[PDB]
């Protein structure tokens, strides 16, 4: 059985009462941090997929937080959602629940915006994640007012620590352990062309990298199917 | 977009504070009452299937209540879960939410125990349901024995009783009044498969029109996640 | 009995899936929109007070939404939380639940940030609210500085603007149209006490009829739990 | 800050998916198991009192489970709610959350039916609880169909292991550590006379026992006030 937790807690980093959904195996569980997309909250994975069922025999906890429309970024005009997602949230989840801390037992995945977030986490903090997966990700954040609120000076984005293309090259230069990477996209997604460009870039860097594509749009039926393939791929 | 409601309310019939999950289309919606199985609560359909996504374009509300381990029965030793499910619960849902009341806009479906409950509702109150569907249903109800006695009372009196779907089907076969659209499915490896085949053969021999489907499967949520999509397409919506 | 609803719904104005808590009397209910403070969400009123009990005999619904750290403002750098709170949210609540629309049956109240929001609603839309109440409100809005800029834009342009409750009060004092019942309270040890005294003196000098109350207290929920009972008794219900 | 958890989990003892509400201090917390009354569920304490606020500075976790209309009893015709509340539930809560196991850090309290339940737990398992409190308790369960479903043969109740009057005498004969006991009741409660009888009985047994009464009915305003006094009395 999986136990389901709707958690209403305080974030000191955000200065905000907020929520997350956690599923735990019932008797230091390896943990998948599962990130939502643009306009989503912490409830969408549970509602629009059968994620709880898919993990049921894996001995795997899943943590599903909320980051509003932040692109997992410490916003130029907004709250500190990167510091939240990369530092405070995992700490809070580990303080509440019997979750692993070891890199080998820690994974991250997300769709769209959360695919960007997952790869950013894996590549900025390779020492914290064994695997990072993007589903139909917004993988090129280079460039309107909302984007400026998130990133600030848009012209400063290429080559920055926000730029997954540059982050991938930096991670590939590490000599320490780095996460395995997974990327998928539906071939009719508006983000498909960005995905192809990222794939062609990241696959030449000597990384442990898996790409998949098939018919699909920016749509939950596609992610319900694909998340099962991500789960099978996790180095659990 | 569908709006999701976790509802904590009081049941006068049960004398108990309890809960249900409701999903509503966002702008008198036709409503599917979607019943849980044995050991489940009002959260299982949302958790183990993508039901909210499956209904998203249908203009269909879904009401998922809890009845504990009652088999949708006014228990001989327990609470009045049949009066709750058949009378109070739909009234409460309609009082809270912009839900239809008309027979033509009212449907019920369930797995296991809830498949029994759905067909019981459809055959006891055919005037209230346009359609009733059972998925891997516990369709023959004739520590575990003690629990059955708590639910049904004298077990020897069950055959032919108003609890017995086989008897209810005989009533329906002779009815001149409204008969709901009726659906039955089961996985061929389910422990309840034999009971399902016996119920199917019974209703078919009576002339009672059912859509019957079977395919490989056990008593598990992968099968119901797939099958509920077929039930949704089949609803006379 | 009151029924409790945790509602997860989509806001088109915000472009965001979000949540609210609603309590409904169990059988077009008059409705109190009850606003949270700075750093709070839609759950705090239920958790830190006995609001559900306090309204239980009033035939009054309560809607408790979330606006993050927005000060109920269409942010210069952020989302449109004023259009959300003043337009979309009441519409959504009324679409989901059997809530009144009439001015005479519509009230708003809030603490801190939400007291500012309540009085902003009452004074910008006096035709929509029979009453507006502020509890320990942040009634003068003229890292923290950067956040204020994200909310309000050019801070130097705030005095006299449509964000400025002092200016809105001047409009109301000259209005021939409907004016809501208005309430203001604050604990005498609250950091916001001085701002509250300045707002009180301003509106009193204008002739704008407020019930004003003060007593020992800080910016904390014990005080609001006590004071919300007085606000409830004061509502023109 | 307190973090709030709505927990939907499976009970093997009950054979049932069920729920509880838990509040945790935010950074082995001592834990108060806080029991609901007749017709209540696991949500009523949070809704009708300010319990979360009252415990906010205490370093105290609160666990609020659901037992339906069972009187915290392994029912003669029903489910095993005593085995659930006394064995499975605390184990599950301790498996999910960072809660203490030590007797010295474990307390129980409840209103009505849950006051009966709390004292039954304290007196049947003195080795597990440092303190047990009843608020407007249904403290005399001696004797309709529902009562028979709960207790079975009603004539067998006097002197039984269901009978708090007898349990109190048995606990007072223990030589090992036993919980401090608290009892209160509103003077206009229908249960007042039963409470006076229990008080007069239990206060002559050499126990650590505190009684309080004041005007009140079987009503949440009274319990909102009284639970604060219980919290101050806990040997925390």
Automatic annotation (TrEMBL), chains B, C:
It comes from the Bacteria. This is Esterase. InterPro entries: AB_hydrolase_fold, Esterase-like, Mycobacterial_A85_antigen. It comes from uncultured bacterium FLS12. Pfam families: Esterase. One of its GO terms (molecular function) is acyltransferase activity, transferring groups other than amino-acyl groups.
